[PDB]
Amino acid sequence: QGMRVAMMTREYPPEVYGGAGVHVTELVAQLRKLCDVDVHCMGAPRDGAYVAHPDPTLRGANAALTMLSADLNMVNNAEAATVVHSHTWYTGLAGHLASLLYGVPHVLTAHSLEPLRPWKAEQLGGGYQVSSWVERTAVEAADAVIAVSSGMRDDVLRTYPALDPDRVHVVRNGIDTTVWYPAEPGSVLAELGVDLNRPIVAFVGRITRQKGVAHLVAAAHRFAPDVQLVLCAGAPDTPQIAEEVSSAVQQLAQARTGVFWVREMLPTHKIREILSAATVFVCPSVYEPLGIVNLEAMACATAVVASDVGGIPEVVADGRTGLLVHYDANDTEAYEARLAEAVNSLVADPDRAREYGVAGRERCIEEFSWAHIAEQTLEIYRKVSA
Amino acid sequence: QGMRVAMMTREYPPEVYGGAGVHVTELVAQLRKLCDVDVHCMGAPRDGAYVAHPDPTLRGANAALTMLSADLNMVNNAEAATVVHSHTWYTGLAGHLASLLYGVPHVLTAHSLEPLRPWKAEQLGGGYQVSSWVERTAVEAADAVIAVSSGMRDDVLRTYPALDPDRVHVVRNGIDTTVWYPAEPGPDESVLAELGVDLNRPIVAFVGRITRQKGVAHLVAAAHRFAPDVQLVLCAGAPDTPQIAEEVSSAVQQLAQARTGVFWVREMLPTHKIREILSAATVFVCPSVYEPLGIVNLEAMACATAVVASDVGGIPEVVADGRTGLLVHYDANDTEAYEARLAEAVNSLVADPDRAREYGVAGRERCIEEFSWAHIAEQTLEIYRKVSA
Ligand code: NA
Ligand code: NA
């Protein structure tokens, strides 16, 4: 006799480290203003969440098995729910079993897809066979799947073609415009030696194949000579790509002045400082179903140059908030030239860069509010509960 | 490396209460003469087995949830296996998850199917939604499914069309020929003495519960047409309804008034006494209207006794018509023909005691040649070899 959401996550404060943990935290804060939400999470005991622990009998067993034991405690804890909403494969089996045991609908947000993970050795172990089976099982049986972009929805339906496309919904990611906002320098830019009197082109992200950092470093050879490139590019996912980016950065620094590389992962206030100071933020991703960093740059009122892959064109409004650059994997020479041409056009026309940045924060406030996302998410809970 | 079978069960000695538990107990004993087997079971701690328990912290949750909790401990315990063999939905997810986690084949024996459970109010609960999902998951992904009869093979293929039929194998239940064997009355407490049965007149034996399914009322009806000196020994108790208690009680009293040799044993009997009665009988009658397996027929055959049985369910895979026994056709729309033909088959074996005796000997031969657990274990090991290739 009243809707009660069991929100199932692995990460929740004070143990949020990834995009999926940030998403659940912000979604729950807004959803609680509309309906009753119980947070089901894993890790350390805390007030205000139902913490699902693994079976202590399984101490030292394979991580996949200890994770399933925590899932069964999570199902046990969720007995009051009228709808269960799971996040990440770590809780997929919890939402699947709670749905079966209690007769309640299962809503699943697809943050990532096990079959699309870039191949690493760990994909040869039993753990990946278990995580792949959980995600297939959870996704194919879910009452609703939420994708944050039409791009991610396409990837979900391609990866799991038994899915009813009518059960897969686009509900965008939000951005908190009280955390991400145009901030004058307090200074990370001083500790780098960046000259605030010269244009700044910024990148923020991990060094992975998918994030296309090598394409931006190649493009930067063609920037006007007083332009500074500030690369916030850390935590490379392979030693090979660390060497490729390191080598490309050294070749760039040989050809031009104003190259800066922040190798360490930065907190929010330092990222906000750099995104705010930038005239252009570049997202050169070759695969970007999500593209959250584009919302962060837009909320900091900075013009964006980005590829047209995945979800990016649903966030970056070409000729209004930024400029899209066509990516074709068979013509990376053209991609690199066209990234540079887009950056160069905004650096040459600072009034246009400023207007695009201003429009970017307006789009965040207008179209990518968590309050609006919470309302659309509640509409999915209504459809599956009817 | 060498083959190491993780045999996954809920029931194992000393906590065996049903057919699936008996099956694993006997199969493991004979498989251990051929290959290394680890017993993975649930319930009370014991020597000689990996006993899987739930998470202590899940004490008091839905029974389906604590069963999945025990399954994860069973998967953890089974890490040395080269093949995992599951029995009942209770261990289906243990075999499925061990196959995924360790990269080993999963053999599943189908003793029953969740979607074919005759409706009870408990099929409205979430527990049944969980048991149904486990079984469909485990069966559709198994490297091999062992069906305990032809009918169970047909039900598996009908209920689970996504499983490749080439992966479904019939391997039947066996019989211990050292506990069921032809046995003389013996000088100490002969049960046939106590009851006042005549060793020198023909004995027709029935052993089962008083249920619609076991058809004792059809045998009582047929018994009116037995030749006059024929003794009916009914080992029939535990009526499952007052209605059939009243009906069968009334029918046996009516039979007792009409003819002499009617002996109605209601108390449950131990093996040594069941053996004595089956051994002494000229004919054992299994008049079941529903009988998936028909194992009681193997007890009579191992005691070297002719069988008269209905042709329902699995009975014709155990009783060889015209060789170890006689099958009687059952049509629910014509129970009067069934009762007359039951009598005609019994009367034919009573009228031809050499034939009754030849069928009994063929019955014991069939037990030793085809239904010994040594043969069942050899056929099972062959499925392990096929899936391990
Ligand atoms: Na800016
Ligand atoms: Na006999």
Numbering used by the authors:
A (entry chain A): -1 to 184, 188 to 387
B (entry chain B): -1 to 387
Text from the published report:
Mycobacterium tuberculosis produces glycogen (also known as α-glucan) to help evade human immunity. This pathogen uses the GlgE pathway to generate glycogen rather than the more well known glycogen synthase GlgA pathway, which is absent in this bacterium. One of the routes to α-maltose-1-phosphate is now known to involve the GlgA homologue GlgM, which uses ADP-glucose as a donor and α-glucose-1-phosphate as an acceptor. Thus, the enzyme uses ADP-glucose as the donor and α-glucose-1-phosphate as the acceptor.
Attempts to crystallize the α-maltose-1-phosphate synthase GlgM from M. tuberculosis were unsuccessful. We therefore switched our focus to the GlgM homologue from M. smegmatis, which shares 77% identity with the enzyme from M. tuberculosis. To help compare GlgA (a GT5 family member) with GlgM enzymes (GT4 family members), the X-ray crystal structure of GlgM from Mycobacterium smegmatis was solved to 1.9 Å resolution. The structural similarity between these proteins confirmed that GlgM had a GT-B fold. While the enzymes shared a GT-B fold and several residues responsible for binding the donor substrate, they differed in some secondary-structural details, particularly in the N-terminal domain, which would be expected to be largely responsible for their different acceptor-substrate specificities. Confirmation that GlgM forms a dimer in solution was obtained using size-exclusion chromatography. This indicated a molecular mass of 107 kDa, which is close to the theoretical mass of a dimer (87 kDa); the slight overestimation of this value could be owing to the elongated aspect of the GlgM homodimer. The kinetics of the enzyme conformed to a ternary-complex mechanism. Although the M. tuberculosis GlgM enzyme exhibited a trace of glycogen synthase activity, which was three orders of magnitude lower than its α-maltose-1-phosphate synthase activity, the M. smegmatis enzyme exhibited no detectable glycogen synthase activity. Likewise, we have been unable to date to obtain ligand-bound structures of GlgM, making it difficult to rationalize these structural differences with respect to function.
